[PDB]
PDB file of C-alpha atoms and ligand atoms in Angstrom:
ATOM      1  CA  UNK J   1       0.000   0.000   0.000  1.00 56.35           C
ATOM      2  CA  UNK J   2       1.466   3.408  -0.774  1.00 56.42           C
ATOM      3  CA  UNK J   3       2.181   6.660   1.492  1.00 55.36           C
ATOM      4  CA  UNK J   4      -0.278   9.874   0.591  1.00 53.75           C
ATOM      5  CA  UNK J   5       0.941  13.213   1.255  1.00 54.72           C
ATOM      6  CA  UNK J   6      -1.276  16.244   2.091  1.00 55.70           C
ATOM      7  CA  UNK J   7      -0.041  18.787  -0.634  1.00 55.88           C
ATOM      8  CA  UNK J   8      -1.004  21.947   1.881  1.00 54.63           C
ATOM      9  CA  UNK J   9       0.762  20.995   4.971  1.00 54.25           C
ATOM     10  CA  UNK J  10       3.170  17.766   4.085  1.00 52.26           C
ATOM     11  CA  UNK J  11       1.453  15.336   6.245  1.00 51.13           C
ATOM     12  CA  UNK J  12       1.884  11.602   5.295  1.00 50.21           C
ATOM     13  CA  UNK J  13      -0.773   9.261   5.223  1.00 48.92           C
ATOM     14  CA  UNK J  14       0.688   5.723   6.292  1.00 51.84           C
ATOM     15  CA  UNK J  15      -1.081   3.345   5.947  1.00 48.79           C
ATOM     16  CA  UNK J  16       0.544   1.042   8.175  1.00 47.94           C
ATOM     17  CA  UNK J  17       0.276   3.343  11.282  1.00 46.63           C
ATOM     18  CA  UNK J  18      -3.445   4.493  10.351  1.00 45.43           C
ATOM     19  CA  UNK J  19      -4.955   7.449  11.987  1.00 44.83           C
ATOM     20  CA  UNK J  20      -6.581   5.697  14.678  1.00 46.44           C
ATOM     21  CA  UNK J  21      -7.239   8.637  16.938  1.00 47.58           C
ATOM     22  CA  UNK J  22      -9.581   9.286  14.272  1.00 45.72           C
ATOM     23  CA  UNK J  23     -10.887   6.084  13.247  1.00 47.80           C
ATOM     24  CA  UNK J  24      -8.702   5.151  10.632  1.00 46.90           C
ATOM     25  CA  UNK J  25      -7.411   1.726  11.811  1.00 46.96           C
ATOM     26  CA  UNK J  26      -3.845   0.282  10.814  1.00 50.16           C
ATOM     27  CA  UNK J  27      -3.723  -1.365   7.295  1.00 51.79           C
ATOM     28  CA  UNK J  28      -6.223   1.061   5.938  1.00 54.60           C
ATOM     29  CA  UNK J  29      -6.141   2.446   2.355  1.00 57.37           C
ATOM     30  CA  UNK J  30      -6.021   5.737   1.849  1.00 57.16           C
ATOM     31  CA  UNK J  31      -8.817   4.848  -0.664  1.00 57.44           C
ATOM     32  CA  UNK J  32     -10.918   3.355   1.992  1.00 56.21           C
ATOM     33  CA  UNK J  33     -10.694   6.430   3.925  1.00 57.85           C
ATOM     34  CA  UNK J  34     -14.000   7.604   4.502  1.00 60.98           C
ATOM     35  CA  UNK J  35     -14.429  10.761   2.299  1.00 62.88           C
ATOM     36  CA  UNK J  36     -15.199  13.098   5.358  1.00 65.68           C
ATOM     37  CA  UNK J  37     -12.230  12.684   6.603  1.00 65.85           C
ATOM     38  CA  UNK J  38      -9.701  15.344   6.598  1.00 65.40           C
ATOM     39  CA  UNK J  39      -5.756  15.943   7.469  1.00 63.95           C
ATOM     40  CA  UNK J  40      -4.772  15.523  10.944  1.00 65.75           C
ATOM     41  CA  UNK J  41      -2.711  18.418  11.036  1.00 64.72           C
ATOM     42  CA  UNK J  42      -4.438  21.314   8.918  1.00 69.56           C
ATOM     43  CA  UNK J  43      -8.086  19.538   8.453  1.00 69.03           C
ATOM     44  CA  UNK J  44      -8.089  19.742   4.429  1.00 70.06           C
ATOM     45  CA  UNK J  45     -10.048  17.123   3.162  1.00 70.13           C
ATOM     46  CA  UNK J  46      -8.864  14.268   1.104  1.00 73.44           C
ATOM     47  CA  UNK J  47      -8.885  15.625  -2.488  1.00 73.04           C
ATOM     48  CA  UNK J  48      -5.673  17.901  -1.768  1.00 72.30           C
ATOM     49  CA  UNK J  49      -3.840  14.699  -0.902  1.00 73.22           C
ATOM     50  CA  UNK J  50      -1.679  12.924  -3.584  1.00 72.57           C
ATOM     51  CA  UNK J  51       0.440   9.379  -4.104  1.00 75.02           C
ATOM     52  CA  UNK J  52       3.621   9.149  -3.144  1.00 76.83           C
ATOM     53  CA  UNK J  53       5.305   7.233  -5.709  1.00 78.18           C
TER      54      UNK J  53
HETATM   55 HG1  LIG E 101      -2.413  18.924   6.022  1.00 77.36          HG
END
């Protein structure tokens, strides 16, 4: 599964940590995300978030 990075702030996504705090469990997608979810850090949502290659 590949890293996403928020293209406002630099956040990565991993998938293997999750985002748990918010319900985003380990082993989760960025896909699978559930849309209204939004950066940790800055709270953009998930369309200004890109693959990391
Ligand atoms: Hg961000």
């Amino acid at each position: 599964m590949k890293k996403y990075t928020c293209t406002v702030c630099g956040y990565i996504y991993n998938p293997e940590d999750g985002d748990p705090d918010n319900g985003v469990n380990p082993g989760t997608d960025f896909k699978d995300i559930p849309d209204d979810w939004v950066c940790p850090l800055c709270g953009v949502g998930k369309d200004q978030f890109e693959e990391v290659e």
